[PDB]
Amino acid sequence: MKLSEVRKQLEEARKLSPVELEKLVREKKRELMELRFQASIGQLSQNHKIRDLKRQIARLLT
RNA sequence: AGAUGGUAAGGGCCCACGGUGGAUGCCUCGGCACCCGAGCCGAUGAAGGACGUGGCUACCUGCGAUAAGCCAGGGGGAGCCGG
Ligand SMILES: [Mg+2]
Ligand SMILES: [Mg+2]
Ligand SMILES: [Mg+2]
Ligand SMILES: [Mg+2]
Ligand SMILES: [Mg+2]
Ligand SMILES: [Mg+2]
Ligand SMILES: [Mg+2]
Ligand SMILES: [Mg+2]
Ligand SMILES: [Mg+2]
Ligand SMILES: [Mg+2]
Ligand SMILES: [Mg+2]
Ligand SMILES: [Mg+2]
Ligand SMILES: [Mg+2]
Ligand SMILES: [Mg+2]
Ligand SMILES: [Mg+2]
Ligand SMILES: [Mg+2]
Ligand SMILES: [Mg+2]
Ligand SMILES: [Mg+2]
Ligand SMILES: [Mg+2]
Ligand SMILES: [Mg+2]
User: Fold this and answer.
1) Which of A13, A32, A45, A54 gives A39 a disulfide partner, CB atoms 3.0 to 4.6 angstroms apart?
2) What angle do the packed helices A2-11 and A49-61 form, to 10 degrees?
């Protein structure tokens, strides 16, 4: 259901849009690295966080 | 003084049981033929690949650094996160 949620947020991301798109993506990107960085060490990772964040990025990218 | 009976190191034939081997029968996601349909794709980068892509992934499948996926329109009505 998280889809309907984030979607509206993105045309909502039309304060600055292409610019905030980029700002927001870059952010989600870091969170992703921070994530897999901790995922590699083992004792700081669950799971579904990644794929959810991965696809999260995708629709932002759209 | 004479006679003709036992032994099986092993071998043979037959019976029983077993090993090995994978024929025969049954089966079938595959193949074959015909008939009907349908019949082009590419510089808006094809056909076909290489590399990559999953939290743990060797291969196959799918996909392309948005990477077993992204958006929207239909379908569908309880399961789903390929093998
Ligand atoms: Mg721009
Ligand atoms: Mg994933
Ligand atoms: Mg955009
Ligand atoms: Mg004698
Ligand atoms: Mg004997
Ligand atoms: Mg003997
Ligand atoms: Mg056998
Ligand atoms: Mg042309
Ligand atoms: Mg050109
Ligand atoms: Mg191709
Ligand atoms: Mg990999
Ligand atoms: Mg996954
Ligand atoms: Mg990984
Ligand atoms: Mg890996
Ligand atoms: Mg592959
Ligand atoms: Mg990615
Ligand atoms: Mg897929
Ligand atoms: Mg999956
Ligand atoms: Mg899983
Ligand atoms: Mg399953």
Assistant:
1) A45
2) 40
